[PDB]
Design a protein around this nucleic acid. Structure first.
Lengths: 199, 190, 345
RNA sequence: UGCGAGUGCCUAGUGGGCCACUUUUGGUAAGCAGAACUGGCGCUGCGGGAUGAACCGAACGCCGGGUUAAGGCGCCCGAUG
RNA sequence: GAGUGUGUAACAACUCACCUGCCGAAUCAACUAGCCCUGAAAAUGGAUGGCGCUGGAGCGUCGGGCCCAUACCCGGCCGUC
RNA sequence: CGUUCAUAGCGACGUCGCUUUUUGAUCCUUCGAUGUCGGCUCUUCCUAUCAUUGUGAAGCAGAAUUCACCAAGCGUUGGAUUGUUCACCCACUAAUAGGGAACGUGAGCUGGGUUUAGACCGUCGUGAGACAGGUUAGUUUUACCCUACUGAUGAUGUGUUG
RNA sequence: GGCGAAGCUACCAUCUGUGGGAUUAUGACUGAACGCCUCUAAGUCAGAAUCCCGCCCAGGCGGAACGAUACGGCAGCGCCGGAGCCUCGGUUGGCCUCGGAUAGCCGGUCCCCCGCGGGGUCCGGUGCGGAGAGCCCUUCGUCCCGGGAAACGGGGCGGCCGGAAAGGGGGCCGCCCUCUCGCCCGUCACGCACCGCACGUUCGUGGGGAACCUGGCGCUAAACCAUUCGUAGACGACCUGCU
């Protein structure tokens, strides 16, 4: 009942357009691997859009001024905040339904990650255009923790390799099963394929 | 205009054995192997002809920004063929007016220090690119020699030691000093 | 309109929170960067500002006008008693920060170290660590921590050691010891921790930490000066004598369209008692404390190879407002931050 | 082609206006000053132009259903998900 | 070429325009219209409304479908004529 | 023009634009009052960059000096005179660049001259008086209210404290 | 009027003041467009008082680890193993995981070669059917018999492992005990058949507080005020000591 959305390969505002509308309908979505969202245009463009955002501070007291978040999770959390009516009570309860994380939490390491085809780079952006990752852009603004995240994501990536290898090991045993049992399940297979299964 | 097709054959010699993992083309032979990924060009790479006699590249429905990327695909490929068959030899002549430029290599050719350039007390430690070998020539008093297989790595190291010997806040037209490219050649001429 | 004559800013723009420090002990905000090449050693240490004195020494720097001539030089005497290691702690790097993993305390904890965990030692029943210390002599408790030590060697990245000073060897009136974690820099995590496993409930002198002519940093708290005016908190220009509302205040604050007084505008407030990290302090002499073989060794405290005297570093009548130094000491070039008897890191 | 017409008494308030398509005077120009026709604000709410005198649509007793004008239909925000 | 350059007191000499030796399909020149860039510099931090958007959520020409105002139709009620 | 050479540096006769740090034009806000000049002190911002960082071009041999670019991070002084904004001079310096923030800044200061009431001189008017002609002396009120800021207690949750 | 302890104080005495990343301006490499050439179009290098981070200061209606957790003359707590009774709200099955490409993937045996992993080759799909246009469970129930499946399976207490970025009611060995009931086809009946009328049906021993219950195990304080200190200080606050 809770969506887990993989952030790699998604546009910034296109994924936020899907997420923010789904949040307001009362359905919790978890956006994960937020270093993987990429932004259209060349890299040197998107740097100055967000570096000029760093210049947006109140002259008299920057401490209460705009909070320039540096982690790619909170950058994506910032762009959903502007697309939601956070000044009202409905908007504030909506942000509690949105959980946005960098890397892969061990809460969601064994959860299947959804992919939105309406926000992917390959389907939305032309192949000849340029794109800029948010993870690389955040580090050059001041996000320190890309080396810690890369070592942990590499550890998470190889940990899923044994599980997938065990999934293939069980799948060949799944496939081996109907090749010695088909002589006694041949009264149960055709009723599936005369209704459109296993074809 | 979106042209329907733009084609060019790449004739390779028999002594070069090449392969390709999709767009990542691997060129190997006598002097070693060369790997260069050909992604982000959005063109296909078809290796046709038995015993691998030619390479063919096409582009479908493109405009003039990626018609110009068709020929740079072949041009990078021939430099990989040329760098494996005959290599790349860029002789690096040094030009000085009064103070001779003393150049000597340290490990094999990797570290090159430049001293007595315009009488400067500051030595200039310049590292070469990986896979690029540097040496001093013979039968002539001062000329540097750069060896390698990749055209981009060898020539960038030549530009590194060319831009290291630059004159500051002087008349460049009079102070014709520094180390400059002399000839662009190969290890053997076949 | 524009300012007529340009002038530099009064006061630093890097030290705006001029509040009284929430802590009294100097805190290491940034430990030195790790490298698995050198052997394991300490990185930080706790001292106490005793006093100051002169050093007449020979400066042999080339190219100077003071070449092969002597100078006098102000230094600061810091009495530095040896530590007692009473525990270790492990840290693991996270995407949200650098979170601690597990804390392992020693079995025998000194009563001076136990004074830190109590706000009122007289009315307390001294029940701290009464049941934790029962997890050592039993085989089940020892096996329960044996896997805990191995858990650190697999998951932790930065290993810091918990050490405290001794108030029994000081002329200080207080008896509550000061705790600080000290990062251990060395090779891999496994043998780095095993060095700290062997050095539990031990004595750590200063020579294990620092040596001759080391080039170190000082961390401490500024001497508090109370609520001071803006002419002393920021050293602004005094107004002339003809002023009616006073002459020790900033005259013009800001403009009419909102320059609604900024953080960068100098105001009156708290001056002193600010945490400061002042770096590049050269050690001249690591001292050796009082020790007796048959007779009292006052001889070898302030004696050099040219003085050949029996004087100690304690002056006639002792150090002012501190006491008399009995333990080994570190002498730091120049003045350091903090007043007398101040806990210095 | 459409509309029921004519006529007599008293009579308040008003007599500082402004804006806009077009024509146009002085001024380099002006959210400047001064003219003609028509329509608006003044006196008027409503949908839209994010906000709002005069812009577009449209003028108002209290409601339900349906349908639109001008605007719009990635989210805020109803609608091309 | 009764000659474009280099050097002689002028010669001597070399080279260019031009033609031949090899290669095989479109090329050149001047205008003109769109999008984009330069020209293009102000003081609190700053505004297609914001977020953001580049097989557009940017521009032009359009085709369906969809949203509602006190606007229109139908119906209920009040009041005036 | 620049020894010949338009464009190194310039650039007439023409022509296109930016700015509100000048004076103008208008009267849209305020006459049941928004304290009207300067100087002192202090904070911040802009680049149309004086110098420093990095560069390109010179009628750049070196030095010294001009033109152009990213670039406001850091600096841009002590004084004689004048109330001066301005202005001129002396010395140092890398330079002594230009400005904005209700022509920054009077419940921050001064009151120097504008701009009250007393006077003197010159002109005008018969006169009372007038002169954006000059000189002299001429009360600068209140924060303890809200916000902003400086510091100082605290509060929210972690069952309680360290 | 001299001199002057301590404490404050002066660039009027003294000490200290930092390392990387990306690139702007620019200079370039390869190289088309335009079979020639070019810093540019794809790509690549160097590149600074610039920007950002590191250094230093504060530490969030932000978390973490650890210690002690009220024996007294009562009491009161913590962990584990029965019914009623207030409040709070949504809720109406779970999907237990590769990475990554988009002018390209999936899964195999591996005759072959290196250290179960990798490469080459070979084989079937590639609008995906080793399909989230998808996967698993499916609940009306019980009583007899027969048929298909099982005999190695369901269920009922201890040892051994894998998990730390904010940590999983996961796997293996049996047993002293109970089955051919569990699920797939067919006979056989029964269950308030509440006579058409709606919030039915779960995660729900759900979170919080009050007191009753039965039994077991383990517990013994801390903070603040007052006083002192003076490294601190307007007052609060901070550092200390006190059988």
């Amino acid at each position: 009942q809770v969506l887990v959305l993989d952030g790699r390969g998604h546009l910034l505002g296109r994924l936020a357009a899907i997420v923010a509308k789904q949040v307001l309908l009362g359905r919790k979505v978890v956006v994960v691997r937020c270093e993987g969202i990429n932004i259209s245009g060349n890299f040197y463009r998107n740097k100055l859009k967000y570096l000029a955002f760093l210049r947006k501070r109140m002259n008299t007291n920057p401490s209460r001024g705009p909070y320039h978040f540096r982690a790619p999770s909170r950058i994506f959390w910032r762009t959903v905040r502007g697309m939601l009516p956070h000044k009202t009570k409905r908007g504030q309860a909506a942000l509690d339904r949105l959980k946005v994380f960098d890397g892969i939490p061990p809460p969601y390491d064994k959860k299947k990650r959804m992919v939105v085809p309406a926000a992917l780079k390959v389907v939305r952006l032309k192949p000849t255009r340029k794109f800029a990752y948010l993870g690389r852009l955040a580090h050059e603004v001041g996000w320190k923790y890309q080396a810690v995240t890369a070592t942990l994501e590499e550890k998470r990536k190889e940990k899923a390799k044994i599980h997938y290898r065990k999934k293939k090991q069980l799948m060949r045993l799944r496939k081996q099963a109907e090749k010695n049992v088909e002589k006694k399940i041949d009264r149960f297979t055709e009723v599936l394929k005369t209704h459109g299964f296993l074809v | 205009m979106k042209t329907i097709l733009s084609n060019q054959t790449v004739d390779i010699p028999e002594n070069v054995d090449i392969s390709l993992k999709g767009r990542t083309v691997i060129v190997k032979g006598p002097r070693g192997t060369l790997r260069r990924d050909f992604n982000h060009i959005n063109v296909e790479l078809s290796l046709l002809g038995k015993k691998k006699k030619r390479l063919r590249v096409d582009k479908w429905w493109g405009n003039r920004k990626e018609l110009a990327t068709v020929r740079t695909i072949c041009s990078h490929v021939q430099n990989m063929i040329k760098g494996v068959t005959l290599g790349f030899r860029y002789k690096m002549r040094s030009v000085y007016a009064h103070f001779p430029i003393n150049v000597v290599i340290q490990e094999n050719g990797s570290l090159v220090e430049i001293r007595n350039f315009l009488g400067e007390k500051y030595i200039r430690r310049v590292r070469m690119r990986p896979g690029v070998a540097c040496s001093v020539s013979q039968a002539q008093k001062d000329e540097l020699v750069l060896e390698g297989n990749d055209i981009e790595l060898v020539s960038n190291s030549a530009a590194l030691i060319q831009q290291a010997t630059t004159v500051k806040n002087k008349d460049i037209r009079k102070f014709l000093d520094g180390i400059y490219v002399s000839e662009k050649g190969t290890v053997q001429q076949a | 309109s524009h300012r007529k004559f340009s002038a530099p800013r009064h006061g630093s723009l890097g030290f705006l929170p001029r509040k009284r420090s929430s802590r009294h002990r100097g805190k290491v905000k940034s430990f030195p960067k790790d490298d698995p090449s050198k052997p394991v050693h300490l990185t930080a240490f706790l001292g106490y500002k005793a006093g100051m004195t002169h050093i007449v020494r020979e400066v042999d720097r080339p190219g100077s006008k003071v070449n092969k001539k002597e100078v006098v030089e102000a230094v600061t005497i810091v009495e530095t008693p040896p530590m007692v290691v009473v525990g270790i702690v492990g840290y693991v790097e996270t995407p949200r920060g650098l979170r601690t993993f597990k804390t392992v305390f020693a079995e025998h904890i000194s009563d001076e170290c136990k004074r830190r965990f109590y706000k009122n030692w007289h009315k307390s029943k001294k029940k701290a660590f009464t049941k934790y210390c029962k997890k050592w002599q039993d085989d089940a408790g020892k096996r329960q921590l044996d896997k805990d030590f191995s858990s650190m060697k697999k998951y932790c990245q930065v290993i810091r050691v918990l050490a405290h000073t001794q108030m029994r060897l000081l002329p200080l009136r207080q008896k509550k010891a000061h705790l600080m974690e000290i990062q251990v820099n060395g090779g891999t995590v496994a043998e780095k921790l095993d060095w700290a496993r062997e050095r539990l409930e031990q004595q750590v002198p200063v020579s294990q930490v620092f040596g001759q002519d080391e080039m170190i940093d000082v961390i401490g708290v500024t001497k508090g000066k109370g609520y001071k005016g803006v002419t002393s908190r920021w050293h602004t220009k005094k107004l002339p004598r003809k002023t009616h509302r006073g002459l020790r205040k900033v005259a013009c604050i800001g403009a009419w369209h909102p320059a609604r007084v900024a953080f960068s505008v100098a105001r009156a407030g708290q001056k002193g008692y600010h945490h400061r990290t002042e770096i590049n302090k050269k050690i001249y002499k690591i001292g050796q404390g009082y020790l007796i073989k048959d007779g009292k060794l006052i001889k070898n405290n302030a004696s050099t190879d040219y003085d050949l005297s029996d004087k100690s570093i304690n002056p006639l009548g002792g150090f002012v407002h501190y006491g008399e130094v009995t333990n080994d000491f570190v002498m730091l070039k120049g003045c350091v931050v903090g007043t007398k008897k101040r806990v210095l890191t």
